[PDB]
Symmetry: C2
Subunit: 486 residues, 2 copies
């Protein structure tokens, strides 16, 4: 009845999915809520801030470091002074990229608050590159336009009339208008359907053969006068319409699908062809979570720029970064108020020390925990194929695909399937009946995500298996009354 | 010669302005660098994270609270679970707004990472409202189009031909095409020149804004049946989605929204029917001498954004307040609504609201003290200082243009837009005072210190400014600009 100031529809919706619990403490892969009696129930967190918590909630090393930084009087707001930590971080990042790819490429670092802000710096930089390409194109055209004019009026050549669908001084200004309606047209950002970053086009990542035809349609030309000894033609010239190409090495919104080699080569072709940078968006992945620092490196994606965010905060603060290759870098760029802050930078260096510690024994751990957890999800799917289509992802960034339940026998399940809430409803079963926090991914919530810390135990994975077998038995048995509340 | 991975042009540019110091520690209004001998030099910070540090750097209360939150195992990442702190915060915010404005309005809270993210939630919500206005408009038109058709073919009325510059079944589809080229046109965000959060309007000339907005007026078409006749008439199409105002415009040199401008923004909002979004993100809560600048300067917003100072100068947090009676619940990010920044938000709000708003009193009198000093300096230094702008502890001095300067060294820097930065370099090296400029020619000097600034600290600032403006008067290029 009473006045509410936030979360009225959210909290209402969460309760009806069976997810309306409040977490009062967290440590490692455990988050705790209070029962009616007032005691702390441990819940195993397979969400982990959508894969942000590669080190689990509130790792004692990150907590120690943060308390140490705060007592040390770390300068949080030092805008427009020397902040060496930015450079210190970009160094370790460049080093890791060199090590993981073979390439001896060098990247400049720009810091930001969110992953969206990191990709937006990339979009602006790519748009600066396209404008540079346009200035050069339109100059060449001016030089070709002059030459053509002093050659039609010299009488050394004559305007072939067959090219006029597209006097002299009139055709010049008539072209100069056509070229101007192009230059002030908006730039194009190629992205894959299942991803949004920061005037775009979403392409079918499942059908890469079809991407080339779709990009080919966006091809636009400007016009010029091509002098050829004795004659002058009105010819078409390629105008750079695409500013950048954006790829997540693991597509959350597609249910944690990995960039296939067939798609990696279509993105490389496009980048080589259109001449615009390939931006690798690793913001939503979580550093180390694929079993390499860089997903891009693991799956052989050769980016011109890269973004990072998740896990760089140590699960306590918010930090993001854009790496742009120095040989392309327009220093025109190089800031925001909260960006490049001192506290998030001190903690970044701690996380990078932690993930790189003991000759990268953290990446080894991630790979084998990921192998263990994938093998369990595959074991469950083999027995529960009526309700589970696939397991997707790599390392500790995995998901199960749910078979469509929009035709379900149960009214209660079928309603929820239809409204796009199946994943949330099955996640409500896993909370109340098994004390396991899972959240779905994908737009029909038709996937279940497993993105826990690298400290997940064999016992914890086993409890997850028991819980999934239980869930998928209930779903098979169309037990609406046990899966859906009311 | 070595490999560099960040800040190569920045650090280079900062050194040539005399700002290439590295701050190793901060407490209160002091930040410290190390000299060649290795000892900590205290520097007085009049920048304070562009007014983010209303409580100064690393306030021991915010630090204690944060350490307490971290040891408590505070859930930082609880996405899609009950997080009551969000509601707890939106309550105190609504309360403060009620108290400072008189109004008993209720606002829903949406949390975000940056001020930009807070204003972007506002733009999307305002754009949802415009689409709702469009759906209703285009329905009414469909109903008017039908009525008109069953009345031209009934023969009860005839199409007045005088309105045809703009058969029947042909004119219907001919209109339905004109209306469709409008609906898929992009929405318009009115903003004032001196801020980004579109069309930038002259805040200095509010009489001129009305004519400019009047030009953006677009119409869709319909058939107006009137008993015996049917006309093709024009109808107002909502083109403007939202109007955006900073109560204090940083990018204009800390200028306050005048009453004359506050009433032109109110008129526009009442006229166009789109929300007035008050952007208080870049101001800093409490810094004007009220929680809300909007409240101090009598700006009546439909939505409000906040960011600066909500982090306690340690974390990043922002919020959009949208009036519940407008709120399209359709709306309601990974890092957004995090547990740590929420725990610290409640601490800042407890601190600023403590002792019957004793903090706002203090801000007003420290601001009065500091403004009175800046005015005393300008009275003697009118050759180089035009104005003092701002209110509370969000003040700036306006520099007279130095693009005509006698000194080659000054005149070059004036021309490249770096005067403010160069005078700030003098204040650092010769007086141990951190000032940064504001505005696009860096033709302003900002003073946005903590509410703990001392009379002795303000006095050192006066001594330093008198010194700076004497050197500038004397066109002493060699002392102001480094070679």
């Amino acid at each position: 009845g009473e006045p509410v100031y936030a979360d009225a529809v959210l909290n209402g919706w969460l309760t009806s999915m069976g997810l309306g619990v409040e977490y009062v403490r967290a440590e490692g892969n455990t988050v705790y809520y209070l029962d009616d009696e007032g005691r702390e129930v441990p819940v195993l967190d397979h969400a982990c801030g959508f894969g942000s918590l590669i080190f689990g909630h509130n790792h004692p090393e990150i907590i120690a470091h943060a308390k140490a930084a705060l007592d040390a009087g770390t300068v949080v707001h030092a805008q427009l002074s020397r902040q060496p930590r930015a450079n210190q971080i970009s160094r370790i990042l460049n080093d890791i990229m060199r090590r993981e790819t073979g390439r001896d490429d060098r990247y400049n670092a720009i810091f930001a608050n969110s992953g969206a802000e990191a990709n937006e710096i990339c979009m602006k930089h790519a748009e600066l590159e396209r404008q540079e390409r346009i200035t050069a194109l339109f100059a060449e055209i001016d030089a070709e336009l002059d030459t053509a004019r002093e050659a039609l009026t010299t009488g050394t050549a004559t305007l072939d009339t067959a090219s006029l669908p597209l006097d002299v001084d009139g055709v010049i200004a008539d072209i100069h208008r056509h070229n101007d309606e192009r230059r002030a047209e908006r730039p194009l950002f190629l992205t894959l359907d299942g991803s949004f970053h920061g005037p775009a086009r979403f392409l079918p990542a499942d059908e890469p053969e079809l991407i080339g035809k779709i990009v080919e349609d966006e091809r636009r030309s400007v016009l010029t006068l091509s002098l050829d000894k004795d004659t002058v033609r009105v010819v078409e010239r390629d105008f750079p319409v695409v500013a950048a190409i954006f790829v997540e090495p693991v597509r959350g919104g597609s249910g944690m699908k990995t960039v296939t080699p067939e798609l990696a080569e279509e993105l490389h072709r496009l980048r080589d062809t259109l001449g615009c940078p390939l931006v690798v968006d690793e913001v939503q992945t979580g550093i180390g979570r694929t079993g390499a620092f860089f997903g891009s490196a693991l799956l052989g994606i050769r980016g011109d720029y890269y973004t990072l965010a998740k896990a760089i905060g140590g699960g306590i603060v918010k930090n993001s970064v854009a790496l742009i290759r120095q040989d392309r870098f327009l220093p025109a760029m190089e800031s925001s108020t909260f960006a490049k802050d001192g506290l998030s930078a001190s903690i970044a260096l701690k996380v990078l020390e932690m993930v790189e510690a003991d000759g990268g024994r953290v990446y080894q751990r991630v790979r084998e925990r990921g192998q263990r957890l994938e093998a369990m999800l595959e074991s469950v799917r083999a027995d529960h194929s009526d309700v589970v289509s696939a397991v997707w992802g790599t390392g500790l960034m995995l998901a199960l695909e749910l078979r469509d339940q929009s035709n379900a026998t149960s009214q209660a399940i079928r309603e929820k399937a239809a409204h796009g809430f199946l994943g949330y409803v099955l996640a409500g079963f896993l909370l109340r009946e098994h004390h396991i926090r899972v959240l779905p991914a994908g737009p029909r919530s038709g996937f279940l995500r497993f993105s826990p810390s690298l400290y997940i135990t064999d016992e914890e994975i086993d409890r997850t298996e028991t819980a999934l077998r239980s869930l998928f038995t209930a779903l098979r048995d169309q037990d609406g009354d046990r899966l859906v509340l009311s």
